[PDB]
C-alpha cells in the first residue's frame, strides 16, 4: 500500500544519508591549511561597451576569445568586437522579452529565447549578406531560461515547466526529454567532454544527467533556497552553485557530497552568476548589491571586489584562454576587466 | 590604420541606425493587464479593439497604447515579474459574480517592491447581474461581518472600500471605475489616468519634486 512504499522511500533516504555520512573522513579546510594564500587581486576596467539601452540580460563569449554576444529588453542582439570596440552585426528580434544567449562553438550560429516559449536560431554565414532565422524550435510549455550548443546540429534547452530536452536542429523535434524536477529549471551547464550535464531548479536541488540515455545518476540537496547559477570545475569532477540564500557551495561527483561554503555575515543579497577561472583556483560571483566578489576555491576567503556598476549585475563570463572577464548590468553597460 | 576604416564606417552606420530606432520607439505607452481568471480581460480587449505573452495595441487621440496580457501562462510569478517594471500603470480588473483569491492577488500586486510607485486602475465588471443577484439573494453570505443595508449602492461602495483598503503606500493613487454596459466609455478613464501620470512624471523630471 501507500504506507509501505512511503516507509521504503524513507528507509532508502536514511540509508543513503548514512552511507554519505560514513564515506566522509576529513574536511577540505583542514587539508588545505598547509598552502599559502594568493594575496590581493587589483583587476581594473579596460573597455566599456555602450550600445545597449535597456537592461542587458545575457552574454556569451566566442571560442576565438574576441567576439561577444549580448541581449537586451529593447529587442536587439548585437555582437561586439572586444579588442577594438566595434559592432559587426545587429539582429532584430520579434519579441522583446528575451532571457538567454548562446554562441555556436564553430562561430556559425546564434540562438535566443525568452517568454515566447520558443528557441530560434540565426545564420551568420549567408550568401546574401544578412542574418536570417533558420529554425523555430517550439514545444515547451513554460518560459526558456537557458540554452547551450553541443555542435552545429543539436542543442539542449531548459524551461520553466520542470523539464529539459535535447533537440535536432535539422528536423526540429525533441529527441530526448528529461524529467524529475519538482520546481522550474533556472540554469544549465555542460561538461568539457559534452557527455553529461547538470541543472539547477527552484526546489533547492541539482542533479546530473546523461545525454545518451535520459536518466539521472546523482542528486545534491545542500542548499536552502532556489538555485540560480551552475558551472563545472575545469577538469569536470566538481561544480559550484549559487542561490538566493546569499551563499555558494562546492560539490563533488565521485564522493557525492558538499565540500565548502562561501559566505559572510555582511552580505544578505542573492547571487545572480557564478564562474571559475582558467586554472580553477579563483571563483567569481555576481551579487545584487551592484558589485561582484572573488574568492579562493580552496580556502573560502575573499580576495577582492569588482565594483563599478550602478545596478544589478546579471551576467558574467570568462574567456577560453582565461585572459579577461566580462560583466553586464541592468544599467545597460558592458565592462571588460583584466 | 589599414583599410579597417570601412569597418569603422560600418560600426558608425550601425550606431546611427540604433539611435534612430531608440528615439523612434519611446513614444508608446505600455500597460499591464493583470486580473483573476475569467474576469473580463478578453472582453475588455476585444471591445476596445499565444502560449506565452499576448500583446494588443491601439491608438486613441494621437496616443499609442501597448497592452500586455501575461496571465495566460502558468508558472511562478516572482520569477518574471521583474521584467514588467518601468511600466506606466496596472489595469487590474475585478468581476462581481464570484472572490477572496482576487483580493489576495490585489494585495500581492500592490505591496510589491518593484511596483512601489506604480499607479493602478481598477475595473469592477458585470454590475447589472451583480445587482440582480443581490436582489435575489443577500450579500452577507460572502462577508459575514457586513451589517449594512442590502441596497445596490451601499454594497458596491462597501466592496470598493474593501478592495481599496489593502493599499498601504500613501504616495500612489488607485482609480476605481464601474464599467457597467456603456458605449465604449471606459477608454476615457485610461486616457485621463495616463495623462495625469505623464504630467506628474514630466513635472518630476524637471526637478519640481
Amino acid at each position, epitope marked *: 500500500e501507500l504506507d509501505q512504499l512511503r516507509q521504503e522511500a524513507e528507509q532508502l533516504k536514511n540509508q543513503i544519508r548514512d552511507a554519505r555520512k560514513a564515506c566522509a573522513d576529513a574536511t577540505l579546510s583542514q587539508i588545505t591549511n598547509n598552502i599559502d594564500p594568493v594575496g590581493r587581486i587589483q583587476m581594473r576596467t579596460r573597455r566599456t561597451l555602450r550600445g545597449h539601452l535597456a537592461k542587458i540580460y545575457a552574454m556569451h563569449w566566442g571560442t576565438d576569445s*574576441r*567576439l561577444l554576444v549580448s541581449a537586451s529588453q529593447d529587442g536587439k542582439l548585437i555582437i561586439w*568586437d572586444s579588442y577594438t570596440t*566595434n559592432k*559587426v552585426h545587429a539582429i532584430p528580434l520579434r519579441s522583446s522579452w528575451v532571457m538567454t544567449c548562446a554562441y555556436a562553438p564553430s562561430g556559425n550560429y546564434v540562438a535566443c529565447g525568452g517568454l515566447d516559449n520558443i528557441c530560434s536560431i540565426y545564420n551568420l554565414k549567408t*550568401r*546574401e*549578406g*544578412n542574418v536570417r532565422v533558420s529554425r523555430e524550435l517550439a514545444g515547451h510549455t513554460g518560459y526558456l531560461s537557458c540554452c547551450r550548443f553541443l555542435d552545429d546540429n543539436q542543442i539542449v534547452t531548459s524551461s520553466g515547466d520542470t523539464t529539459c530536452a535535447l533537440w535536432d536542429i535539422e528536423t526540429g523535434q525533441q529527441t530526448t526529454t528529461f524529467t524529475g524536477h519538482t520546481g522550474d529549471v533556472m540554469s544549465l551547464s555542460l561538461a568539457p567532454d559534452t557527455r553529461l550535464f547538470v541543472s539547477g531548479a527552484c526546489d533547492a536541488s541539482a542533479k546530473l544527467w546523461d545525454v545518451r540515455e535520459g536518466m539521472c545518476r546523482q542528486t545534491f540537496t545542500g542548499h536552502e533556497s532556489d538555485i540560480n547559477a551552475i558551472c563545472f570545475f575545469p577538469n569536470g569532477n566538481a561544480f559550484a552553485t549559487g542561490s538566493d540564500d546569499a551563499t555558494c557551495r562546492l560539490f563533488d561527483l565521485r564522493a557525492d557530497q558538499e565540500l565548502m561554503t562561501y559566505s559572510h555575515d555582511n552580505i544578505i543579497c542573492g547571487i545572480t552568476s557564478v564562474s571559475f577561472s582558467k586554472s580553477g583556483r579563483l571563483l567569481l560571483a555576481g551579487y545584487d548589491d551592484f558589485n561582484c566578489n572573488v574568492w579562493d576555491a580552496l580556502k573560502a576567503d575573499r580576495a577582492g571586489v569588482l565594483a563599478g556598476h550602478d545596478n544589478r549585475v546579471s551576467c558574467l563570463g570568462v574567456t577560453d584562454d582565461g585572459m579577461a572577464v566580462a560583466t553586464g548590468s541592468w544599467d545597460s553597460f558592458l565592462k571588460i576587466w583584466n | 590604420s*589599414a*583599410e579597417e*576604416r*570601412a*569597418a569603422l*564606417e*560600418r560600426s558608425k*552606420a550601425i550606431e546611427k541606425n540604433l539611435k534612430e530606432d531608440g528615439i523612434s520607439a519611446a513614444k508608446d505607452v505600455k500597460l499591464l493587464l493583470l486580473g483573476a481568471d475569467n474576469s473580463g480581460k478578453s472582453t475588455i480587449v476585444k471591445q476596445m479593439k499565444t502560449t506565452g505573452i499576448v500583446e494588443t495595441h491601439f491608438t486613441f487621440k494621437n496616443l499609442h497604447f501597448r497592452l500586455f496580457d501575461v496571465g495566460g501562462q502558468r508558472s511562478e510569478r516572482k520569477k518574471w515579474i521583474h521584467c514588467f517594471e518601468d511600466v506606466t500603470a496596472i489595469i487590474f480588473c475585478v468581476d462581481l459574480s464570484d472572490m477572496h483569491e482576487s483580493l489576495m492577488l490585489f494585495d500581492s500586486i500592490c505591496n510589491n517592491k518593484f511596483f512601489i510607485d506604480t499607479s493602478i486602475i481598477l475595473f469592477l465588471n458585470k454590475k447589472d447581474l451583480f445587482g440582480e443577484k443581490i436582489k435575489k439573494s443577500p450579500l452577507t453570505i460572502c462577508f459575514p461581518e457586513y451589517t449594512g443595508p442590502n441596497t445596490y449602492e451601499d454594497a458596491a461602495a462597501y466592496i470598493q472600500a474593501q478592495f481599496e483598503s489593502k493599499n498601504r503606500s500613501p504616495n500612489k493613487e488607485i482609480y476605481c471605475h464601474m464599467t457597467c454596459a456603456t458605449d465604449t466609455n471606459n477608454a476615457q478613464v485610461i486616457f485621463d489616468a495616463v495623462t495625469d501620470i505623464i504630467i506628474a512624471n514630466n513635472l518630476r523630471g524637471c526637478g519640481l519634486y
Partner: single-chain antibody, 232 residues
Framework: DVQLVESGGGLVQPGGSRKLSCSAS????????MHWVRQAPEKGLEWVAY????????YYADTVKGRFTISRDDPKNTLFLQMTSLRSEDTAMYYC??????????????WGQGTTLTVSSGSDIVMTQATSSVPVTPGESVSISCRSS???????????LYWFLQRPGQSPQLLIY???NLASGVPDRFSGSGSGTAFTLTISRLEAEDVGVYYC???????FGAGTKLEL
C-alpha cells in the same frame, strides 16, 4: 542565384561620352561596396574606381581622375559609371565586382560578366610575377610565386595578398584571401603560403579543369600583377 549584369557597350568615336550600368539582384545591395576592374584585350587587369556602401567615400585611379565618375542608386539596385572625353587607350572590358568589409569578411568574392567598349583609332606598390609560361601534366604539382616591393604585413598581424583564377573565356574567381584562407567553394587541393615579400601558391594533384591564368593582387593601400599561364 546571385547575379551581376552589365550593359551599355558599343563603338564610340574619340572625344565622345558613354555610360555603363551594372544592375544587381539576388543579394542585399545596400550593404556591399562596388569596384570597377578593366583589362585590355591582350593585357592584365587594371583598377578604375570604388564606391562605398552608403556612399561617403570615393576613389579613382591616376589615369582616370577627372574624366570618370561613379554613382549608385540603392532603391533601383543598379550602379552607374559616366565616362567623358574617351581617348584611344580606353578599349577594354569593364567588370563589376563585390566586396563587404568587417572582421572576418572575404571581399572580391563575386565578379560580373562584363561589356566590351571600343574606340576608333585617330608612391605606388609594384607587384611583379616571375614567368609567363609553365607547362605541366595532370597528376603533378606546380608552384606559382609573385613578389612585391614593400612589406604587406601590417602591425595588427594581417598580410594582404589575394589570388585570382581566370579560365579560358570566363570571368575570374577568388581562390585565396589574406595569403592563408581558402575561399568558400575552392577545393582543398589549393593552398597558399608566404612571408614578408615572398609568396607562393601550390596546387597538388593537378586536374584538367584547373588551367588558366593566375593573378596576385595587394590590398594594403589604395594594383594587380602581370599574371602567368599554364598549358597542357
Amino acid at each position: 542565384d546571385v547575379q551581376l549584369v552589365e550593359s551599355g557597350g558599343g563603338l564610340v568615336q574619340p572625344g565622345g561620352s558613354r555610360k555603363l550600368s551594372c544592375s544587381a539582384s539576388g543579394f542585399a545591395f545596400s550593404s556591399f561596396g562596388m569596384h570597377w576592374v578593366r583589362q585590355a584585350p591582350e593585357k592584365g587587369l587594371e583598377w578604375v574606381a570604388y564606391i562605398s556602401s552608403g556612399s561617403g567615400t570615393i576613389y579613382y585611379a591616376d589615369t582616370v581622375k577627372g574624366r570618370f565618375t561613379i554613382s549608385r542608386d540603392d532603391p533601383k539596385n543598379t550602379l552607374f559609371l559616366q565616362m567623358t572625353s574617351l581617348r584611344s587607350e580606353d578599349t577594354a572590358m569593364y567588370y563589376c565586382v563585390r566586396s563587404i568589409y568587417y572582421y572576418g569578411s572575404s571581399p572580391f568574392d563575386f565578379w560580373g560578366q562584363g561589356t566590351t567598349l571600343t574606340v576608333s583609332s585617330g608612391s605606388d606598390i609594384v607587384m611583379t610575377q616571375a614567368t609567363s609560361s609553365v607547362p605541366v601534366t595532370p597528376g603533378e604539382s606546380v608552384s606559382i610565386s609573385c613578389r612585391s616591393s614593400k612589406s604587406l604585413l601590417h602591425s595588427n598581424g594581417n598580410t594582404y595578398l589575394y589570388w585570382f583564377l581566370q579560365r579560358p573565356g570566363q570571368s575570374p574567381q577568388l581562390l585565396i584571401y589574406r595569403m592563408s584562407n581558402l575561399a568558400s567553394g575552392v577545393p582543398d587541393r589549393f593552398s597558399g603560403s608566404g612571408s614578408g615579400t615572398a609568396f607562393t601558391l601550390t596546387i597538388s594533384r593537378l586536374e584538367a579543369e584547373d588551367v588558366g591564368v593566375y593573378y596576385c593582387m595587394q590590398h594594403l593601400e589604395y594594383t594587380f600583377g602581370a599574371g602567368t599561364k599554364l598549358e597542357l
